[PDB]
From Swiss-Prot, chains A, B, C, D:
Annotated GO biological process: amino acid catabolic process; carbohydrate catabolic process; mandelate catabolic process
Organism listed in the record: Pseudomonas putida
Cofactor(s) of this protein: Mg(2+)
Official protein name in the record: Mandelate racemase
Binding residues annotated for Mg(2+), in chain numbering: D193, E219, E245
């Protein structure tokens, strides 16, 4: 009955509202691939993929264009499509870029499904829309800018910020945390992200000093793939260890949870396998007793978390704002699902034209 | 937008096409509760619950009638409804009869959801309909009747039968298995169910003799709740141990899988928590590497298994055939989802009137 | 020789001396089922069941009335009766409402046994009566009422109170604990109950702050069924974790103890399987090294704990006081078994008439 | 001193000497990317990457072309280069296509290193060249062709063949194994590959029947990423379980070995991280006590295995034969390293021109 009839992809480099500071330098643009999934019913599903670095952007788009042939003419049934792709790529390696690509199709396919039934994605998954608490995600900004950005966030109504740390000296990490605290008061959440930059012993030492400061969570303290090493750092902390943005598929999350690597999880809608992967990851999180937050893709995450038993926080990081209408709104620090079928992503065609690669 | 506006329940005692023989005696009827879930959209969701024994039938219906007040006027959103009930019953004990009842509402609620969107349940879950291999489930029938019933099943096209064993002597269990084999040939599957009737040492002994015969699986050899004891029996077998019909909620299945109690799982749609519980159990089965079959509720299971990554077998045991139209058909030993919105359950009002309790 | 000859049940809604405050609102009545077990010897055993919510009350009574047929004419031998019921319900699910019902019959059957031999239950179990320290159990009462109620308890001679916590902010939980402490002095015990309301990370954080305050125990911090999650919270505390009120049968307690979920146990006489289940649970507690307290059913618990090797505290929460004579007395904060055959439960027929449902 | 000065890549689709039969159909060509790594010393390193499917070929080449900018002007020091890339891709995901690409550069970089020092790679790694036993790798060929191909292999001097199995029926897998055996005699090795096509229970059953036949190893019986599931199948076999062709980096091999997933390993030079990854994987294999064989890349594997303490077999599967000179020779079933600097890969420029994509 409803068939997929085409796939069109466009690679852009969009400006970021909040340039992200890093050890290297400032990055003011995001490399995205926009996807349009056409169907025999006259509706188009939409989604986007984040490439992380301009180095992979063209390659990601080419991969997607080359896979269009496997999905054109298949029924618009995301669970069954996902099983087919996992089988086609079983030798090449259903992970990395290939898995991300497939996740792109899944999210667009679900968006079209919601449109066929004229219903918001959240409702198609069987849950009600509810606002989700969100925190504003900042970067490796230095004491002054980090403080400045936190003050603005509280001004906009957020009740928590995420800062990135990992300066050369521990003393610099703490300066930043303290300056934020002083300007925002003691209620306020302050999440901190190490972005995989420390070895285990250094992680235990810096984390215990931070725990004494009062942070909400300690995220990705060491190499993302070393589960066992995250479990060792967690074993010496009261504050929770957060991770999950880099799990490629729920079978990687299962491995890390099976070992006790962390006390909080934050899957990335794209890497986790789209809507289909997320539903799976949510069942796991529920059973292991782990609060689950999101990483990027704020548009679809708002819907995904509402249907997530252990939902915890939504990460506000607006990558695609320049090319999409602002249908997701934040009120009182909570993300509010818009009442539009699918995920509610609507392109600003005019602008996309400017950033085309 | 779509609200639940009423709940009506009717308790019946229906005749069984295949009287089930047991150690005690023959049972020719099934105690069911039919549920009708009305909604503000003009559609009615339907489902049924199996009470196992007439002893619990009135109590089950009374429980459901008494909970109608908590769900009337709530939005028709099964995932969110399920979370609310788990919270209302957190002190009483969200398990047993209460959990079964809630599972009744979930299945009816999902059936209504499929009707609101005029789509079969399988498609609403995001998968395509596909036929599912099914095996015909018989009872503790003795050599002659068990053989007879197997021959008929193969005549009707099935390619596997389940017999119940656990006679006073092992030698009787084997007589039955061998007589079936001789009449159906070596290709044919022969599943055997102990229904929790042996202690661990007796299970290891009888199972190893059966493994030598050639059975497809060994199901519930000891008390259902002794996970660790199932893991011990499994540790000495090549043939797989099957179980799962008695898990109340995916959190019980999680416990048994975490320990390696079995190599096959067969959740019961009602005890597992309905459609919402099943989706959860399917994610777990996928990650632990376990083929997953169904227990009873053949109507909705056909749809559920099509959306189940590790689907394995559908259990044909027609409890409600006397009061429902035969929309599910078996062709070539495979169950075929009917193309009707929801689950495809349509009452035979006329007959229900006869079996009313 | 002594046979069971009848079962009569009456469902009531009794007033509580101490209205229990909850997040939802105040509850001033308890839904109970009273049971009378008649015997061929001319004696009647008595017991009661607590239904938790009015939603389950009629269903519980109907279940009991429907099972009377299986026990009428059986010998008055509680251990053998319990084995028979566990076998009749092996498919339906010997847990939840069914298990509670069976536990009702067990307690009444033991009460009749004590009456046949004209001896208090404690003595029939082979132990001497001894007073048991008891603590007064209060609710989610707020700083003012919680303090008030604690002061009264100390006035009545108790040397410990249980308060329920789990306010929206940790700071509210602590305010309450501190206000109580200030009014009762530092000797005094202060137990706190979370009633399953926190996720694991939140439990570790709030518990460590409370441990610093000085509480006696931290009870049910997270979902009752997540044993592994209780073990994680316990692993980061010095103060003990308490739980057990929700174990359905000693086979659930065995599972939680096998994993180290807690350092204290407090089985509920009804859910644990009656007198027969308790004796079993007491043997387990002894071997795992766990002090064992009671949950509700103060009348029979006084007798049960005297025969319990690791007995610890008796929970004073008078559910049935309105319809039973006050034969159990508290003197000097210790419950005192009355010297009457059986459990010493004697109905106030007059009043029961008022609360009948 | 020696700098990398350029990277040129060419995507080809080469004919295979031995068309590979699969469940789907016959594939007569291999999608490869050839890499030329230029250096300031006047030497060019060469290597190739296998893309598995034409779907990923253009994307792989584009990725490599886009990363050339990060390596141009860096010193020709493969260990240090590899650390730099692992750090650049730490957010995107250093695995999948990105990891394969980086592995392409590593192998070419090592080939150039051997050329700068005018020495064969094996000698630069500190070991002597020695012949390595090799087995001829065939496909899902059916009884007749599989037998035919085995007979030819023995004619050419090989003393072992690998066949792929996984037919719809176990009986078909065995027919093939037996027919081969009959034509090659009992000495001969017969390896069998399931290519991830069975679930765990089906793997245990089919493997035990094969073990009875007499195979050398059972390779990839279930999903490659389910380590724990491979460990379960291995636990019921005497014959060893082989796997490793799909490990992306030694950190995935470490995970599988840490759990006992298999008794033999066979890393793939490209997926394992090139020469730098292999040296690492060889140290692990040595310590866990596992014989280590190769998967594809026969040219460089011959050198790699000579420096590998637990070396076991070399897999003969000639993907690039159409575009490279035949410097690697097989004599007496043993691969013989050629005496040429680097890996000994020399392009047939003329032909490459024909297969260019
Ligand atoms: O958690 C986060 O937001 C960061 O780790 C992050 C990683 C990659 C891109 C942007 C942001
Ligand atoms: O697996 C099965 O079918 C049996 O265990 C079974 C149990 C309860 C009712 C009917 C059938
Ligand atoms: O431990 C306790 O007393 C509470 O958890 C409690 C639970 C249920 C009913 C009353 C009281
Ligand atoms: O081990 C082997 O050779 C096979 O698994 C194989 C896999 C992928 C490509 C070619 C061959
Ligand atoms: O530093 C990072 O977070 C990363 O490189 C990044 C983040 C957001 C946009 C572009 C690039
Ligand atoms: O023996 C059984 O399977 C069980 O008691 C039963 C099965 C089917 C219908 C009624 C009762
Ligand atoms: O909140 C509770 O403790 C529970 O709902 C309750 C307790 C005591 C009587 C009635 C109900
Ligand atoms: O079936 C396979 O082995 C795989 O798809 C393949 C192998 C060799 C060349 C091309 C493709
Ligand atoms: Mg992060
Ligand atoms: Mg069964
Ligand atoms: Mg309590
Ligand atoms: Mg292979």
């Amino acid at each position: 009955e409803v068939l997929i009839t085409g796939l069109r992809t466009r690679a852009v480099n969009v400006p970021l509202a909040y340039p992200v500071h890093t050890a290297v330098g400032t990055v003011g643009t995001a490399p995205l691939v926009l996807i349009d999934l056409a169907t025999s019913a006259g509706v188009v599903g939409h989604s986007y993929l984040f490439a992380y670095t301009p180095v992979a952007l063209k390659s990601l788009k080419q991969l997607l264009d080359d896979m269009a042939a496997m999905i054109v003419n298949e029924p618009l049934a995301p669970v069954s499509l996902e099983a087919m792709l996992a089988k086609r790529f079983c030798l090449a390696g259903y992970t990395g870029l290939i898995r991300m690509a497939a996740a792109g199709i899944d999210m667009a396919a679900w968006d079209a499904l919601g449109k066929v039934h004229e219903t918001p994605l959240v409702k198609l998954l069987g849950a009600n829309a509810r606002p989700v608490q969100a925190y504003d995600s900042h970067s490796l900004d230095g004491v002054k800018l980090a403080t400045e950005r936190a003050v603005t966030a509280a001004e906009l109504g957020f009740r928590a910020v995420k800062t990135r740390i990992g300066y050369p000296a521990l003393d610099q990490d703490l300066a930043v945390v303290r300056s934020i605290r002083q300007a925002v008061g003691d209620d306020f959440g302050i999440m901190v992200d190490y972005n995989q930059s420390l070895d285990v012993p250094a992680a235990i030492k810096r984390s215990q000093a931070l725990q004494q400061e009062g942070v909400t969570w300690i995220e990705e303290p060491t190499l993302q793939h070393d589960y066992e090493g995250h479990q060792r750092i967690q074993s010496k902390l009261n504050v929770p260890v957060q991770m999950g943005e880099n799990w490629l598929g729920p079978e990687e999350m299962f491995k890390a949870l099976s070992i006790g690597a962390c006390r909080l999880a934050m899957p990335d809608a794209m890497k986790i396998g789209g809507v289909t992967g997320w539903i799976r990851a949510s069942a796991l999180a529920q059973q292991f007793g782990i609060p689950m937050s999101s990483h990027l893709f704020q548009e679809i995450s708002a819907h995904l978390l509402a249907a997530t038993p252990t939902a915890h926080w939504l990460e506000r990081l607006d990558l695609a704002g320049s090319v999409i209408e602002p249908t997701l709104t934040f009120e009182g620090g909570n993300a509010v699902i818009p009442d539009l079928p699918g995920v509610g992503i609507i392109w600003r065609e005019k602008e996309i034209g400017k950033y085309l690669v």
